[PDB]
Structures are given as C-alpha cells and as structure tokens.
Design a protein around this motif. Structure first.
Motif, mmCIF file in Angstrom:
data_model
loop_
_atom_site.group_PDB
_atom_site.id
_atom_site.type_symbol
_atom_site.label_atom_id
_atom_site.label_comp_id
_atom_site.label_asym_id
_atom_site.label_seq_id
_atom_site.Cartn_x
_atom_site.Cartn_y
_atom_site.Cartn_z
ATOM 1 N N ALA A 1 2.043 -6.081 2.389
ATOM 2 C CA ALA A 1 2.966 -5.167 3.055
ATOM 3 C C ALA A 1 3.317 -3.904 2.086
ATOM 4 O O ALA A 1 3.303 -2.796 2.454
ATOM 5 N N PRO A 2 3.917 -4.125 0.967
ATOM 6 C CA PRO A 2 4.240 -2.788 0.011
ATOM 7 C C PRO A 2 3.206 -1.845 -0.230
ATOM 8 O O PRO A 2 3.271 -0.777 -0.170
ATOM 9 N N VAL A 3 2.092 -2.285 -0.461
ATOM 10 C CA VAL A 3 0.980 -1.620 -0.792
ATOM 11 C C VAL A 3 0.685 -0.860 0.342
ATOM 12 O O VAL A 3 0.450 0.568 0.444
ATOM 13 N N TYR A 4 0.269 -1.299 1.619
ATOM 14 C CA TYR A 4 0.258 -0.766 2.740
ATOM 15 C C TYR A 4 1.218 0.283 3.132
ATOM 16 O O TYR A 4 1.019 1.432 3.705
ATOM 17 N N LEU A 5 2.426 -0.101 3.091
ATOM 18 C CA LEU A 5 3.708 0.762 3.268
ATOM 19 C C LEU A 5 3.747 2.032 2.632
ATOM 20 O O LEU A 5 3.788 3.127 3.062
ATOM 21 N N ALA A 6 3.475 1.680 1.293
ATOM 22 C CA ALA A 6 3.381 2.957 0.252
ATOM 23 C C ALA A 6 2.246 3.926 0.479
ATOM 24 O O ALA A 6 2.257 5.201 0.392
ATOM 25 N N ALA A 7 0.937 3.164 1.091
ATOM 26 C CA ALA A 7 0.040 4.081 1.530
ATOM 27 C C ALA A 7 0.223 4.877 2.476
ATOM 28 O O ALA A 7 0.001 6.098 2.691
ATOM 29 N N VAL B 1 -3.433 3.331 9.443
ATOM 30 C CA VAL B 1 -4.101 2.240 8.979
ATOM 31 C C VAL B 1 -5.397 2.531 8.668
ATOM 32 O O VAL B 1 -5.753 1.541 7.589
ATOM 33 N N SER B 2 -5.834 3.693 8.451
ATOM 34 C CA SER B 2 -7.019 3.994 7.644
ATOM 35 C C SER B 2 -6.958 3.874 6.362
ATOM 36 O O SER B 2 -7.371 3.132 5.406
ATOM 37 N N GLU B 3 -6.047 4.672 5.797
ATOM 38 C CA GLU B 3 -5.409 4.934 4.391
ATOM 39 C C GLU B 3 -4.695 3.418 3.773
ATOM 40 O O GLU B 3 -5.207 3.350 2.808
ATOM 41 N N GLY B 4 -3.748 3.051 4.719
ATOM 42 C CA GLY B 4 -3.272 1.608 4.202
ATOM 43 C C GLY B 4 -4.461 0.633 4.227
ATOM 44 O O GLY B 4 -4.377 -0.180 3.316
ATOM 45 N N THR B 5 -5.186 0.421 5.015
ATOM 46 C CA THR B 5 -6.160 -0.641 5.052
ATOM 47 C C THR B 5 -7.337 -0.436 3.979
ATOM 48 O O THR B 5 -7.447 -1.220 3.223
ATOM 49 N N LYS B 6 -7.757 0.768 3.865
ATOM 50 C CA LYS B 6 -8.698 1.231 2.709
ATOM 51 C C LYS B 6 -7.980 0.788 1.492
ATOM 52 O O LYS B 6 -8.422 0.400 0.698
ATOM 53 N N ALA B 7 -6.491 1.280 1.095
ATOM 54 C CA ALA B 7 -6.027 1.216 0.182
ATOM 55 C C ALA B 7 -5.850 -0.423 -0.210
ATOM 56 O O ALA B 7 -5.808 -0.744 -1.407
ATOM 57 N N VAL B 8 -5.172 -1.113 0.715
ATOM 58 C CA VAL B 8 -4.996 -2.495 0.501
ATOM 59 C C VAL B 8 -6.503 -3.209 -0.123
ATOM 60 O O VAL B 8 -6.158 -4.168 -0.982
#
Lengths: 83, 96, 108, 89, 96, 82, 108, 90
Positions: free
Chosen positions: G38-44, H77-84
DNA sequence: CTGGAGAATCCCGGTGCCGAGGCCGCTCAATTGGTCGTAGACAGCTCTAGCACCGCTTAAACGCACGTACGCGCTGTCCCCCGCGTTTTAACCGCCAAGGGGATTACTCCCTAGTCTCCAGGCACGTGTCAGATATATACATCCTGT
DNA sequence: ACAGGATGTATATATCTGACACGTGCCTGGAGACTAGGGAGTAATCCCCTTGGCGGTTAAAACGCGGGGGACAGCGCGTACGTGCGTTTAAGCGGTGCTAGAGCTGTCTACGACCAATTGAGCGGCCTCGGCACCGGGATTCTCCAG
C-alpha cells in the motif's frame, strides 16, 4: 436473448412520461425522451460501474444489493432501505 | 362524441396520483436484462440479485425525479413549462 | 455472584443501546479513545431525533387512519422538517416517494 | 439491528401504532448513517486539535456543527441531562 | 472632446485584466472590521490573525467568483446577460 | 469603538471588479445588496463554524487553520494556508 | 554496526517519502492494519500525479518566460487537466484565479 | 515537516532549471495531504463494506480505480504496479 | 363567463387471507469490576506579534453627469406531443426442476504491527544574488470616432 | 462596413534590491532486523435461489389519428447601470511601544481501553388474526360541455 440487444427502449417512453409526472414535469419535449435515455444511461453506467468495481474487488460472481447501496454512497447519494 | 380529456388533465391527475402513491413503474425483466446487458463489459453470463435490480430501479427513478425537479426549476426559471435537453445538461454541470 | 447489570441507557433513562453503539464507535476506526460520556450523549441525541421522526410519522399515519407505519410517512416526516431535510438533502429513502410539490405556475 | 429499539421509542410516542419491517430497516439505515457522520466529524475534530481522544466536548461541538438550531439545542439539553443522570448513578 | 469610453469595453478589460492577475480586490481593514463585527456575537473584543482575514478574503472572493459563474450560466441559459437576484437564489437552492 | 455597518465596507465597485473576475458582464443594481446579504449569510455560516472550532479549541484568537477546516467542513477545501 | 539503510522510495525508484505517508496512514485512523504494498503503491501514484501537474505547471511557467513557479500556473494545471479538474472541481486554491473562460455569447 | 524538497526533487526530474515559491509549495502540500486523506478514507470504506480488517495494495488499487478517472487511473495502476513489483524483487 | 352533465377517484359498506405482530427457544453480547498507562488539563512563563497609537498621501470610495445597452411583454407562427383506443407482445403470473454459487467452517499459512538503535535527509536559520520591482519609451492592439 | 487616430498594455530596454536559494548545525524520524500474533486464503460442503424450462392472459408497449397548447423571434418601449472624473476620506504606508495571549514546558491527575465471567435482552424461527386486499356501488370532485 443472449448478448446485447435494443434494450435501451427498456425504460419505455410512457414509463419516462410516468416518472416525469412523479417528478413534477408537466410538459415533455420529444427530445427529452432520447435525452433521458442517454443521460440516464451514462449515469447508470457510472454508478453501476462503480458497483461492479466493488464486486470485482469482492471476489464474487453475483452482484449483491450492498454493492449498489455503497455505490450510491460513493457519489454522495446514500441509500436507505436495503441494508 | 368521444370521451377524451384535454392535454394536461390526465398529466396533472397522474402527477397527483403517482406522487400520492409510491409503487415502481418500470418492468422487471426488460430493465433487469438491460442492467445485465450494460454489465456485459465486465463478466459474461452474470447472476444478479432480484432485490439488487429493485434497488437499481429505486435509485434510478428517485435520481431522475430529483434531477427533473431541478430541470423544472430551470425551465420555470427560464420562463418555460416544457423542459429542454440543455436544462438537464445545466443540471449535470452544477451537480458535477 | 456479581452485582446485577442494568443497561447504561436505563441509567441515563434511554432506550438506545449504549453498549452496541459504543462498540461500533470502537470498531469504527475513528479515534484511539472514545470518552465515556460520548455514547450516552450520542444515544440521547439519536433517540431524541428518532422520537421526532417517529412522532411525525405517527401523526402522518393518523392522517390516513392507519396504525402501521409505512416508508411513505417517513418520507413526509423527513422532507417536512427543515433541519432534517438539511441533514438529509442528498439521501434516498427506498419506496418513500416525494412530498406533493407542484410549482404554482404549473397549477391551473 | 436496532429494530426493536425504534419500536420501543414508537411505544413511547404512539403505543397503539405499529410499523412495517421495511420502514424499520430504513430507520436502521438512518441511525447507522447519521451515526457514521457524527463519529467522522468527531474524528476530524480530534485530529485538528491534535487530540487522540473523542470526549463529550468533541461530540457536543460536533453535534453543534452538524445539527441546525433547536434540534442541536434540545439535543444538548436531552444529552446533557442524560449524562448528568448517569453521572449521578 | 472627452475620452469617456463605451459601456462594456472597460468591463471586458477588467474581465481579461483581472482574470489575468490573481490579487485580492477588497480593502484589508474594512473587511477585517466586518469579520470582527459579525464575530462579536461570540466574544467581545476578539483578536484575529491578519493572515486569517486574508484567507477569508481569498475564500470569499473565490466563492463569489464560482457562484457568479453559475449565476451567469443560469442567465445566459435563461437568455439574459444581466444577472438578477433570482439567479443567485436558484444557485443557492441547487447547491443546497 | 464597537464596529457597526461594516457590511457596506465591502464596496459596490469592489463587487463589480470581483464579478468581472467572476466573468459577469452586466450587473443589476439589486445584485450589490443581494450580494451583501447572500455573501453575508454564507460568511456567517462558515465563519460561525470556524468560531465553533475555536471555542472548542480553547483559544481567544482565531487562527487561519480554523478557517481552512471550516471551508473543508462544507466541502470547499482551501489550499495555501496549512 | 547494523546494516546499510536505504529509503523505501529509492528501492522502489521513487522520490516521495514512503515513511511519513505510511505514518500518516497508521495514525490517520483508517484500519486495524495497512498492507506493505500500500505505501509504495500510494507514493508511486501520488508521485506520478505530482509529475503530471508539475509538468503542466512547468510548461505553463515557460509560457510566460519565468523560472519560478507561482500558484497561477497550478490553477492553470488543475483546471486544464479534465481528470485532475474532476478530482479538484470543488477545491479552492488561494491566489490562483481561474482559467480565462468568457462565454462565447459574451464576447463581441 | 513538509514534502517541499521532495516536490523539488520531482521538479528536478521534470524541469531542472525551474524554481518555485513557498506559497505554491504549501498549496501542493495541501493537495498531497488532501488527496491522500481521500484515498485512505475510501480504502477504509472498502475494508469496512466487506468486513475486512486489512487494507492491502489490492484495496488501494481498487480505491485508486474508484477515485481516479480513466487514463490517470490506468497509469496509476501501471506506475504503482511496476513500482511495487520492482520493490518486491529487492 | 356562468351554469349543468358525467366519470375517476375517493369513499362507503362488506368479506377472506396472510404477514406483522406477538411468542418462544436459544444464544452471545452488554454489563460490572477491577487494573494499567497515559492524554490532557493546569500554572507559570516567554516573547511574538497583535493591539494601540502617530503622521502624511492618494488609493480608493462616493457622488454626479451623461449616455447607452439591457429586459420584457404581446401577437403570431407553427408545430409537436398529449390523449385514447386498439392490437400485439411477452412480461407477468402461476408453475416445474437442477445445481451453481453464496455462504459457511475448518486448516494453515504468512503478512503486518510493534521495538530499539542508528543515522542522514531534513529541520531552522542565516546569507547573496538575479528575479523581480521599477523606470522609460513605443509599436502593437483595441477601440472608436470618422467617412 | 471601411479608415485613421489615440491610448492602454504588453513590450523593448535599462536600473536597483530582497526573498529565494543554498549552506550549516543539529535532530528525530525512518530503515533494518527481528518477533509474535491473527486475517485471510483454500478446500469442500449445504441448500437457496438463480437459471432454465411450460403455459395462458392481459398489462403494457407501440402506434395512429386528431388537435390543443407551448417555444420562440421580432420589435418597440423604456429603463438604469457603467464609465469617467472631481472631491474627500481613512486605508495605506511607514513608524512607535507595549503587553495579550499563542504557544511551550513542566507538572500530576483522571479516564478510557482492556479482559473475563455472567447473563438477560435480544436473535431466529414459529404461529395467529385483523390489516389489508378485494369487491361492489354512490358521493364528491374534477373536468368539460353548454347556453
């Protein structure tokens, strides 16, 4: 009756005239009927779509009434009378 | 000699009548199939609760009722008694 | 063995359950701590508002000589109170209908 | 649910009048919804003033924020009276 | 010969010019005294932050801007170009 | 002295300038007084709610944050003061 | 003595601070527990949106030949991006003004 | 404490030769904190409605899909998904 | 415009059925009774900055003179949507039947909160400079008088 | 409508300063690593109600044939608000001095969370009858024709 059809007439024209009477409308333009199908269609797509977002998150194959209620709440149009 | 009413008589009578009553006016099966049909874009062969369709009718009719009341406020405000599409469009803009 | 239990509502002379509402507050993710006077005070306010709505609905039911309350009376009650309608201007009540309201220029 | 409690209040206001189940569900939704509003506003009231406890002060102020006029005033009257009554017991 | 210009031209220059800029258009001290004067009904001799009054001017003027835009939408919608109080009343009604 | 009739300090020319910034092209004479009334009631509501925060906040001076939270309370969140 | 630390943002290739956002989530009264992604996703997501608005804002500042960003360009950035405008339709930015929007009939 | 210099790092990614003002930075901090609270609140409702007591990246993802309109949500969703994903291999 | 005729709906009267209302097992949650740790009230003090006060200018408010550009009603034009009956479908209603899947429970994993230490990005706070405040002159842009 | 003139406003150009940009001392909050508890997944089940079928009726959708009644433009009246300018003010600018009170820091008390054991109101299921549905028929009410 398998896939998409001409069900956009499902909310029928005299039903629109009845609902408009319940809404207090006294005269209805012919363009209003098509306008109602389009605007109402878009609105329902938005709300029901958000409900589907809850349901697909909910790991279910059946849309329950709660999804519709919470969907109405999501847009600040909270619903009383279904739980 | 036909027994025909003048325009507005049946209109206003059903206004008072259906506003006095509270029962649902849309047909179960066509509206439910329309719901499933629009819903096709997410999952094929969807199973929907009947009461969910009942709530859909409740929200749909109530939403239209309030929206057309505002449309009426605009039309009367714009010196009309026959509503136009742009009144609905204005209402959507003010609402968002 | 222990002393008898009475509802905290009855100690405050209330009907609404201080315990259950208090539990919804605790499990409702609102704050770390909820003051002891808060559920009593809240239950009193909600019971008061409830008494207002039920009282108006009862009156409305009397206005059609019926003893069983239906949603229609709740609709009439909510929309006929300025402060509740201000509290409930965006809410939809199932099967409630609308107050009779036809603009003067539309009436003959 | 809170069904029978709304029925208790109904017997306090109209002992010979009944109520449908569907309307009772509606009232249960009303109680839960307004309850969530009040608790939410009390939550942000605690946050704003860097408080981690929602007390009677926050509830009272929140009720004053949420309820217009006499409903709020008499709500403070009935609530405050009730809290006094429990404070005795 | 006077250099008196025409009605509407200078209005348009104010629209473009002041919508091109962002500074506040109300005097600080009278507005501040109005805030304290209305504020009297809670505590006499109230002390206020200057920047808070400035924020009040910010919110106030922005709120008026948005509300009058909606008003203008109603007026043009109702086929006028001169706003009337009824438009403001309709705006407040639909906004809640 | 105590303040009186400062509702007229929000002058009509200032209201004209704002309405031009609001995009209004023609302004009725009744609009100015209507604006003083409507804006007055509005500010009474929002500022009143801010005072409700302040009286709760155990302070004698209204801080900017109170105004910000008051604006948030009516769903009109304010950026640029905290 | 302990191991080399490294920000969670850099491990995710992010600029925004994972830790304080996570702390606000924990002390923000939202849930019993908050997932690790959640925090990584949110910060992204917030960093991406921030890049969008700062990009539009930076271009807008370039359009007036200035190097320092002012609130005006933020107002332009918000009201010019349909989705962000939808996100921020009822929010007020101090000293932002509005987009130049004169109704067509009002122009001569 | 504010996100000022972090927004400055993002600025150095998008426009290295461009500066900023404190007031606009405050506005941006208010934007981040506000949108943040909206996202967390909606995630809270998502956990509550299905009586889940855990907010995971799934609830956040769905929440983002609820709040952000269209293509911004898709790239979120793209950036967050890739990032995570990128993080979970580190 | 004033007065008489008729039907829909309400209402007045009379009848049977079933869901609401009251009963009845059966939980399980609210209550009491403690204890523990701490949020927050309190007191005094700091010292910013808000109040209070001084003094001169013109930005700005107020008022006036002038003109213009704006709302609004009426009549006509036309034009289109309401009203009702008729037909037709197929939803509706009443009926028949399987099993998908909602919901559950039972197991078991594994994901996330909590701690302690460390330290480095950031916090507060000063400092110089070029962005910006300021000055001056002009084609262009905008209006508008003039033709 | 077409043409030339005049002036605001951004622009060309030129000058002067302070708040933004960057540095520093310092810190405290985030990362590492580790544990422990418990939310949610997976599997397989029961049985509700969804799906899927039969079958007749008429509610209701669709359509057609009037025709009543409403949106809209022109246009003329007729007003009242904008623009500018001149006068006058007190806000604005800037300058002065003190202490009210926001905020902090150090107290210490008080309050709300927590757990366990009991239990009685309430939960879920189960009847029972008069509320409600159904029906039949006239007053009122509302519309509409009639003189």
């Amino acid at each position: 009756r398998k896939v998409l059809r001409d069900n956009i007439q499902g909310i029928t024209k005299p039903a629109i005239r009845r609902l408009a009477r319940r809404g207090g409308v006294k005269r209805i333009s012919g363009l209003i009927y098509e306008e109602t199908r389009g605007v109402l269609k878009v609105f329902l797509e938005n709300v029901i779509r958000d409900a589907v977002t809850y349901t697909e998150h909910a790991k279910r194959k059946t849309v329950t009434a709660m999804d519709v209620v919470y969907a109405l709440k999501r847009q600040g149009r909270t619903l009383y009378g279904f739980g | 000699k036909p027994h025909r009413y003048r325009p507005g008589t049946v209109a206003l009578r059903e206004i008072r009548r259906y506003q006095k009553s509270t029962e649902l006016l849309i047909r179960k099966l066509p509206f439910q199939r329309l719901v499933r049909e629009i819903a096709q874009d997410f999952k094929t062969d969807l199973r929907f609760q009947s009461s969910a369709v009942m709530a859909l009718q409740e929200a749909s009719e109530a939403y239209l009722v309030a929206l057309f009341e505002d449309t009426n406020l605009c039309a009367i405000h714009a010196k009309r008694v026959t509503i136009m599409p742009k009144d609905i469009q204005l209402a959507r803009r003010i609402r968002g | 063995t222990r002393a008898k239990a009475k509802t905290r509502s009855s100690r405050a002379g209330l009907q609404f359950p201080v315990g259950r509402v208090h539990r919804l507050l605790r499990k409702g993710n609102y704050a770390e701590r909820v003051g002891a006077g808060a559920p009593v005070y809240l239950a009193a306010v909600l019971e008061y508002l409830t008494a207002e709505i039920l009282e108006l609905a009862g009156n409305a039911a009397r206005d059609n000589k019926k003893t069983r309350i239906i949603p229609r009376h709740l609709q009439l009650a909510v929309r006929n109170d300025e402060e509740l309608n201000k509290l409930l201007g965006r809410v939809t009540i199932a099967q409630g209908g609308v107050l009779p309201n036809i603009q003067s220029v539309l009436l003959p | 649910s809170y069904a029978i409690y709304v029925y208790k209040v109904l017997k306090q206001v109209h002992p010979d009048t009944g109520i449908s189940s569907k309307a009772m569900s509606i009232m249960n939704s009303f109680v839960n919804d307004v309850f969530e509003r009040i608790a939410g506003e009390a939550s942000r009231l605690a946050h704003y003033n860097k408080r981690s406890t929602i007390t009677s002060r926050e509830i009272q102020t929140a009720v004053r924020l949420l309820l217009p006029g006499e409903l709020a005033k008499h709500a403070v009257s009935e609530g405050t009276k009730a809290v006094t009554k429990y404070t005795s017991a």
